[PDB]
Design a protein around this ligand. Sequence first.
Ligand SMILES: CCC(=N)C[C@@H](c1ccccc1)[C@]12Nc3cc(C)c(C)cc3N(C[C@H](O)[C@H](O)[C@H](O)COP(=O)(O)OP(=O)(O)OC[C@H]3O[C@@H](n4cnc5c(N)ncnc54)[C@H](O)[C@@H]3O)[C@@H]1NC(=O)NC2=O
Lengths: 666, 133
Amino acid sequence: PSGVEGAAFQSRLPHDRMTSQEAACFPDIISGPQQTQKVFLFIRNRTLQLWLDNPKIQLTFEATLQQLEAPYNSDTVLVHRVHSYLERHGLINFGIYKRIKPLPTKKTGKVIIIGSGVSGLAAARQLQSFGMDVTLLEARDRVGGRVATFRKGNYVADLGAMVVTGLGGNPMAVVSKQVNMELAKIKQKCPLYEANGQAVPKEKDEMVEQEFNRLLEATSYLSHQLDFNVLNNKPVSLGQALEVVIQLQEKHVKDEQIEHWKKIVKTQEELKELLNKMVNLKEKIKELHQQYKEASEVKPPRDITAEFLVKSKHRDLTALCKEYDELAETQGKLEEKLQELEANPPSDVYLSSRDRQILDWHFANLEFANATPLSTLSLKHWDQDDDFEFTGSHLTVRNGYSCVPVALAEGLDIKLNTAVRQVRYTASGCEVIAVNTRSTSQTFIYKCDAVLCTLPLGVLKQQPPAVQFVPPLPEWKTSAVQRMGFGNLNKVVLCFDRVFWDPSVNLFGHVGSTTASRGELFLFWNLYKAPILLALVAGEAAGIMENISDDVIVGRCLAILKGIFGSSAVPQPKETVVSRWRADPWARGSYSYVAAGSSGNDYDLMAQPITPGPSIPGAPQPIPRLFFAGEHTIRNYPATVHGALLSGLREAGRIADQFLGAMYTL
Amino acid sequence: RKPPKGMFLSQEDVEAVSANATAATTVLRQLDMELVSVKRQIQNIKQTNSALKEKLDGGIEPYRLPEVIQKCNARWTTEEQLLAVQAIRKYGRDFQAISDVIGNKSVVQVKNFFVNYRRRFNIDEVLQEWEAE
Ligand SMILES: CCC(=N)C[C@@H](c1ccccc1)[C@]12Nc3cc(C)c(C)cc3N(C[C@H](O)[C@H](O)[C@H](O)COP(=O)(O)OP(=O)(O)OC[C@H]3O[C@@H](n4cnc5c(N)ncnc54)[C@H](O)[C@@H]3O)[C@@H]1NC(=O)NC2=O
């Protein structure tokens, strides 16, 4: 899409319809006449376009009105309302832009932001941009959180986020124009290599993959069409459902063999009855011919009865010979109908051990994409976010993804090495207690109007708690924290002195030996300028490999590589790095997934701010004080950088509305 | 509305494989045995039919009698009439058989005979005695 309508699309908005959010701010318009709505929609789409055409400079209300046409530029209170709305909710002027109107000299309100991850940073920038007092508290000695980038010499490899999942409607598409990211397209082609160290042929490869995709649609069919979602009170997982489907497919293959061989017996038994009748006829014929012969022995001239006997027996014999020939006829048809059915048996097996192994690689891939054993994913909802997939080729940040959080961090009050221990929120404001990660007995206290919590879900999950909430988070929030899944996936960075793999190939799989190890070093990435191969550890393997030393891991890495590329083409690696996200105390995992028994709705619960009780009893309902951003809070874009980024923009909007007032709603 | 084509997922089957933990492995074994059960039954009848096939060896070859090619006549030699009476006694209304025995009389001439020599050859009595067997 292009024009003003491309801008709406690129901003994840329907170009010809007002969103629920827009209805909330412009209820005069959306309940009003259709004419005004289209004026509104155009002004919105047009302003978005203007921002999108040039995201390196701030788009002011003046600049916007300047480039609008009659009849649209006539009503300025509308144009002003629209522009302000877009700016507030970070649809325009977000990320890193050059300001035209230098920041308000004195700030209003004070916000503490926990964590300088991307969601944290994105909010910080917005709030500071709205003229608020913002300070981020990061436990790590670096920004970006789950955007980690290994750097040494010229070796650059992301141990965290690595892929931009398409620029079509991606907020990262704007960020990429603002920040020097080197975006290289990822060539889709991925050759698999069995345990032996030799390629799967295109024959197999395609027939397994197509079976895999067939198997998924099947699970989708069990979920939505057969309502197969609860089993012994427990919510049905995807893994479960995939098994149930494979089983039913194995069952059917047998059902087919039975009914085919059952065709053989039914026919082979018709032949039996016929051969029996045939033996009994060659029996009567044998004896009847004897009698005719005995009557022909009585030499002429004979009387008429004796002549009759000869004639009679002759007729009776040719009558029985007619039948035997008609039965040798029938025998011929049935005897070939057997070589017919024995020529084409149905399928021998559903899948062989070679097949089931390649299919397991495809399962490993899904386990990687969701950073979790498929036995944990919700059947009904594991892909609830599919509709909001971006368009275009997936890309890599060739200069390392960290270039983004670092870029966003510029200009912000960030306290590194500062581990938040306790968040206290009350009717009259909040205080945050953090310590110094280095010498931990050294304590800090922060007073603020509001707290923005961007703590990873795995962190919020910690038992016993890493961060204490005073008063405790309400049960509706903590149940959402429990129900939700927070997965795990790890990366192995292999740095060499030379390329020894197909340089025109970005990714190539390794098929594991067992179901149990299907995610163990199952995939390899050739993405970077330097000679680096990156190796994924997904599924159940991810959680176990964290207990294994780097050498043992790199050993298996080299072994696999030798198997594929020849035992002497694979040298000893110059530099190696192994991630351990579940072990990492500031993550406690990689990213969230829709666990079985959760839904996309739990993500909304995560995003809902907390409003403390009143100080003095009988005093009015307070302002909300505790707010949440993060990958785990954005229903339509979970588990991603853009999603985090967007959630940060979301909360900054909401916080500003709350503490600076929304002038644009009148 | 429907599964992917060739995939089998009936409401009934789904419940059967999920009824317990190894109800999967149970049903897959019932069929594995049902197959082996039928498979040996195949070789059993294959064996039986092989023996029956060999007892039919040579066919009915040393038993066929060369073809009697004779032109259909209209007149009744006393011979032919007497052949007929006995054929009726042995075949009843099987005009085809009676025709084949007499050799040179058409299926209709046989039927004609029935009404012509009806009184003289007491064909009523002859036929009623054919039925008596
Ligand atoms: C669903 C698709 C997907 N999985 C995306 C990835 C992908 C995979 C496969 C194919 C294509 C793409 C994805 N790949 C990927 C790979 C790996 C290994 C991991 C771990 C993650 C990803 N993601 C997910 C994002 O990295 C993640 O959602 C955001 O970075 C999180 O930001 P925040 O919410 O701010 O938390 P955050 O970044 O963790 O920030 C929280 C901060 O709080 C700090 N903190 C914690 N505790 C305390 C405390 N007590 N006091 C103070 N501070 C504290 C902490 O240090 C941290 O800095 C990728 N996203 C993506 O867009 N592309 C990718 O390729």
